[PDB]
């Protein structure tokens, strides 16, 4: 039947679904990770090759204020060469929003052969990854005690991967990227920029940019580190030429975290007696050894948990996908407010796209962390290992956890969203004094305003005397302007910011509620006492007990994907409106700031009608008025994303029993004309129809926001 075709592509990469031997499972995982590294190196080879061959990068490096970055040219077939837009400088292409040019300028790239030899090195190292995956599987695969050496793996990845990676990048910053960006910010044209090996061969050429280099590596070994305080600086603020962070703060950052990570890579005991072991740290976290505030975790505590990490790859994937969500969320929030690349903060199409991308990467990773947490509890969890420890006691009060979470989701939905419905009703009545607003009933976010005042008072310098400028200009300080364009200014928080932050707290808590109830009730419940015996992924247990549709832990990941999408859409909508309204814009010749949407977030974002009219209706005029221009691919992708959203609701709202009885009549008509095939035509399964419906829903909604974000910012940003 046709179900075998869909089941084969779904049974592809789960390895314990075959014969479960952990050493052979761990070897297929270790060599597939080499293959995914070869895919990343092949994709990195493309971005450096298209940056070296199909770009305006040498033209953009002359004057990065008035030149738009392009790195994709389009062939002249079917009339599709209209998308090759003028970027300035006579170059016709597609305006890229990834920010590769701002990344390459800060790293020290100056020509299009340096990007070429980086593309060759990524093409070489991709072939080295698909040899190491062949060698460490088909020739000399390791065995299970090598995979179980946590203390050696933690020591080698803290000190060796992160410590030597950022120390080695601090070598590239100090000897290549600090002189190249110091000459560029002091206005030196690119014929006169020395090639980056001449800052090492001609050592005297770095002496006049940094006089501490004449005194050599000798103050480092004698701990006279204050001699170096002109290329490793604790400045803060932004560069007034580029808008990026100070490159001497970036170098001293990657020096200080290098020492902190190499120190961290000596914490664990491997072969020499010195260090902590993972088992002794976990077997001691229990009563009576903990604090008396934590007496509730009981006498076993964390004692049975090391057998999880001995046996379960899914449980480690659950933690690591969560922390890649934590890292990518930090990358989103910290790179808009402390922009680390030159001429990044005033490229508004790039700041929009970089925040939105790394928010969405983080939200899929968090759902995957909850998905593979439920796979561990169904497949890998053995209850004999966990008697009265913190895993067993969590499963024994799951009714208190879910019902307390269900209450706080209802509290947050009333006391965030229903206050917008209060505000919609009060404004329609003509009672603006009765609204939750800065001019009505104020809800000042006083704890976030207090932190902003602390973050400003810290630099001067009550608690951090070492800075000159602020950590970020979003906290306080002043307006940074690059090319009469705002790079970063203080972001004022009012009643509109109190309300949208409690919307975020509401939509995250519900997304936790869908995912945590799926994990905590994955093995059994009061409804299905043998739910773990039915598997991780199954449609239901029949129409009985009232109806048991979507009880499986897979279907909670299915519902959690919609709620993650609903949560992160409001997050990027909060970002896109507030940056256009209160941050981005133009410093006039008068001295006054005229923002993009003119400061309308404080009064219009407090109702649903203002989000519909002033955000959704007003700002989508660029994407719907793009037909017959160079932004017309965004206008086509805008309607294409609307199509797949409506198309997804056929799979989500219907069931396969209709479609199987519809197929028998078309099977009948194919049999009357004698053209039957052997593989028998089946409707999709109940889980396949849910997986297709959620994939097309998320694809339809994200492509629509992507076309709306990028058509507006490529026109007016």
């Amino acid at each position: 039947t046709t179900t075998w075709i869909w089941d084969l592509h779904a049974d592809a990469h789960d390895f314990d679904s075959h014969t479960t031997d952990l050493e052979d499972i761990s070897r297929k995982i270790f060599s597939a990770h080499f293959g995914h590294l070869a895919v990343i190196f092949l994709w990195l080879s493309g971005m450096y090759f298209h940056g070296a061959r199909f770009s305006n990068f040498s033209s953009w490096m002359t004057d990065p204020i008035h030149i738009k970055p392009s790195a994709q040219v389009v062939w002249p077939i079917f009339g599709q060469e209209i998308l090759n837009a003028d970027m300035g400088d006579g170059f016709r292409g597609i305006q890229i929003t990834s920010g590769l040019f701002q990344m390459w300028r800060g790293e020290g790239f100056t020509h299009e052969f340096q990007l070429f030899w980086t593309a060759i090195g990524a093409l070489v190292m991709a072939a080295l990854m698909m040899f190491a995956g062949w060698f460490h599987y088909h020739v000399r695969a390791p065995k299970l005690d090598w995979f179980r050496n946590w203390e050696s793996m933690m020591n080698h990845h803290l000190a060796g991967l992160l410590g030597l990676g950022s120390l080695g990048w601090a070598g590239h910053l100090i000897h290549v990227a600090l002189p190249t960006n110091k000459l560029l910010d002091a206005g030196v044209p690119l014929e006169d920029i020395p090639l980056p090996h001449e800052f090492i061969l001609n050592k005297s050429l770095m002496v006049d940019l940094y006089p501490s280099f004449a005194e050599g590596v000798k103050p480092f070994f004698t701990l006279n580190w204050s001699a170096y305080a002109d290329f490793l600086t604790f400045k803060g603020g932004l560069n007034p030429v580029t808008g990026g962070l100070w490159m001497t703060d970036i170098a001293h950052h990657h020096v200080a975290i290098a020492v902190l990570f190499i120190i961290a890579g000596h914490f664990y005991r491997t072969n020499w007696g010195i260090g902590h072991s993972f088992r002794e740290l976990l077997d001691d976290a229990r009563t009576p050894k903990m604090l008396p505030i934590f007496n509730f975790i009981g006498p076993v505590g964390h004692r049975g948990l090391d057998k999880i990490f001995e046996t379960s790859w899914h449980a480690n994937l659950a933690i690591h996908l969560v922390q890649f969500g934590t890292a990518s969320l930090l990358v989103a929030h910290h790179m808009y407010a402390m922009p680390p690349y030159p001429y990044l903060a005033t490229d508004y199409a790039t700041v929009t796209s970089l925040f939105t991308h790394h928010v969405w990467i983080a939200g899929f990773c968090i759902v995957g962390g909850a998905a593979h947490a439920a796979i561990f509890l169904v497949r890998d969890y053995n209850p004999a290992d966990h008697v009265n420890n913190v895993l067993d006691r969590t499963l024994r009060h799951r009714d208190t956890v879910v019902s307390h979470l269900a209450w706080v989701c209802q509290f947050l939905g009333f006391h965030s969203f229903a206050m917008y419905c209060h505000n919609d009703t009060m404004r329609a009545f003509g009672r603006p004094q009765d609204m939750f607003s800065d001019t009505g009933i104020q809800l000042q976010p006083i704890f976030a305003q207090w932190v902003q005042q602390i973050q400003t008072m810290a630099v001067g310098g009550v608690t951090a005397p070492g800075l000159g400028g602020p950590v970020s200009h979003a906290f306080g300080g002043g307006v940074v302007a690059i090319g009469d364009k705002i790079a970063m200014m203080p972001i004022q928080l009012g009643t509109a910011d109190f309300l949208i932050h409690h919307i975020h707290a509401f939509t995250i808590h519900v997304t936790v509620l869908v995912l945590l109830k799926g994990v905590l009730f994955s093995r059994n419940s009061r409804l299905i006492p043998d739910k773990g015996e039915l598997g991780f992924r199954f449609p239901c247990d029949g129409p009985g007990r009232g109806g048991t549709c979507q009880v499986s832990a897979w279907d909670h990941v299915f519902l959690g994907l919609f709620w993650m999408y609903n949560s992160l859409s409001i997050v990027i909508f909060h970002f896109f409106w507030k940056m256009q309204s209160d941050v981005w814009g133009t410093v006039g010749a008068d001295g006054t700031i005229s923002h993009i949407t003119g400061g309308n977030f404080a009064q219009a974002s407090i109702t649903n009608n203002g989000w519909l009219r002033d955000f959704l209706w007003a700002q989508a005029s660029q994407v719907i008025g793009s037909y017959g221009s160079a932004l017309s691919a965004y206008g086509l992708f805008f309607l294409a994303g609307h199509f797949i959203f409506g198309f997804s609701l056929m799979f989500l709202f219907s069931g396969r029993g209709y479609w199987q009885e519809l197929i028998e009549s078309i099977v009948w008509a194919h049999n009357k004309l004698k053209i039957t095939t052997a593989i028998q035509p089946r409707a999709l399964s109940i889980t396949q129809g849910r997986a297709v419906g959620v994939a097309h829903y998320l694809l339809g909604g994200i492509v629509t926001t992507w076309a709306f974000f990028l058509a507006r910012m490529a026109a007016i940003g």
Binding site: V387, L395, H397, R398, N524, R526, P529, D530
Partner: protein, 98 residues
Amino acid sequence: TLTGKTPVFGGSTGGLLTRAAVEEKYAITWTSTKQQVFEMPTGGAAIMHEGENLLYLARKEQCLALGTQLRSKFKPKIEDYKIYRIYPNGETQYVHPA
């Protein structure tokens, strides 16, 4: 009329409720040859005793899912489990095996 040690268990939030005292209750009794860990149908791990056990549960499906685990997850198998239905007046009816 029902003999057995209660399994070693710290209690949970998935156990007996108001329905167990006012409508009907269920008890599963089995003998074990060793002290070993089983999974409760209400969530969590309990320790059965060597010899005769007795566990009160809320639904008949929870007792039969426990008896399925006793027959399938332990070597040697535990097949001798008996399931009773207890009414609020103390009237106990032997329902499995019938």
